[PDB]
């Protein structure tokens, strides 16, 4: 059987790069006005899946790009 793609992650990954998974970022939903405007503006810009986690999540997005 073909490995299934964890489509719940794929709805939040975006591959591209030279193999790196792109981003999406936390605390970005609701409940503002407790984060700083500094925290607010900076969590807006996106950052990759970490080396240590790509070690763990490597299998699920095997079909992304």
């Amino acid at each position: 059987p073909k490995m299934k793609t964890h489509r719940g992650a794929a709805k939040r990954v975006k591959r591209t790069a030279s193999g790196q998974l792109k981003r999406s970022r936390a605390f970005t939903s609701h409940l503002f006005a407790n984060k700083s405007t500094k925290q607010k503006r900076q969590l807006r810009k996106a950052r990759l899946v970490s080396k240590s986690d790509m070690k763990r999540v490597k299998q699920l997005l095997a079909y992304k790009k």
């Binding site: 709805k11 939040r12 936390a26 970005t28 939903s29 986690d53 763990r56 999540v57």
Partner: protein, 127 residues
């Protein structure tokens, strides 16, 4: 030489047989070295993802073909029985420059930085 064969050196290695004597006769020692030992790959005991999701996907997406077209000294195009594009959904012609020959390009949606050079040696545009 059918009785004195030999595989290419470097291919082929004797597979590892665990559990067959005391040059290793095991795997781990307790916990999940139980048969069909779990942990989901992912399921690290608290979220893992659960952190944002950004999505869509729609329709129309072209198929690129960069100006590395050192073809003939002229002639028309889209003819890709020639060894260039294949599996095309459209055909944009992009850059990475070297319009070293003069010809007449033809495909749908040409890139401006490209077509500035294609038309600066022989002129060429189409749908």
């Amino acid at each position: 030489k059918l009785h004195e064969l030999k595989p290419a050196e470097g291919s082929r290695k004797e597979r590892n047989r665990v559990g067959r004597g005391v040059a290793t006769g095991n795997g781990k020692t307790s916990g999940r070295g139980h048969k069909g030992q779990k942990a989901r790959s992912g399921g690290g005991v608290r979220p893992g993802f659960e952190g944002g999701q950004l999505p869509l996907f729609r329709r129309l997406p072209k198929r690129g073909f960069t100006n590395i077209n050192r073809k003939e000294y002229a002639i028309v195009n889209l003819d890709q029985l020639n060894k260039f594009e294949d599996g095309t959904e459209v055909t944009p012609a992009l850059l990475v420059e070297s319009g070293v020959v003069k010809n007449e390009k033809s495909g749908i949606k040409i890139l401006g930085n490209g077509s500035l050079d294609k038309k600066l040696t022989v002129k060429a545009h189409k749908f």
